[PDB]
Amino acid sequence: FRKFTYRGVDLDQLLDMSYEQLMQLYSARQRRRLSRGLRRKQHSLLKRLRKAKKEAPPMEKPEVVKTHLRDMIILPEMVGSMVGVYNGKTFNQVEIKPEMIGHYLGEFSITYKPVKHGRP
């Protein structure tokens, strides 16, 4: 019900914010990932999100975009996106919610199915 707040700042204030203060906003592993820099193979994914987001009618959630990049940080721009994260066999569509900020896309694309020993 209440607004989502990340360390004490709400969603709309994240998006209009540069990265130099976004590093010290959250975890050490993530800020070192951004302090080390991104790759053009990864920048090419971000533009594919805005390309998929402005092409969405305002009452429809945007188009599905697929990727093999399980090693991408959920930064507050990717909110509201249908990413087809690759498992290794298939692309499982998951919708980014604001609560997934600061994690990897691979975390929500399970690679194995859970085991159940009884009842074949």
């Binding site: 707040t5 990340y6 360390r7 004490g8 700042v9 959250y26 998951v94 919610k97 609560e99 997934m100 994690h103 691979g106 975390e107 929500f108 399970i110 859970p114």
Partner: protein
């Protein structure tokens, strides 16, 4: 503890995910703050959160040989 000149790196809850306030949590808030982050990782359907939902090792231990006691 803050105004009593206690450093930030002593606190069991540093940089909270909601309020980001460096606080120490004490024995009643501790366990309720312990099922908030657990259920937060479950609603987002994170792999780390589902491992708690299933009762498995989450920090990436080999479950093939150990962890048998509660598992009948």
């Amino acid at each position: 503890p803050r105004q009593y000149k206690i450093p930030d790196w002593f606190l069991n809850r540093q940089k909270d995910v909601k309020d980001g306030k460096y606080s120490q949590v004490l024995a009643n808030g501790l366990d309720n703050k312990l099922r908030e982050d657990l259920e937060r990782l479950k609603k987002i359907r994170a792999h780390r959160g589902l491992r708690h939902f299933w009762g498995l090792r989450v920090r990436g231990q080999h479950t093939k040989t150990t962890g048998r006691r509660g598992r009948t």
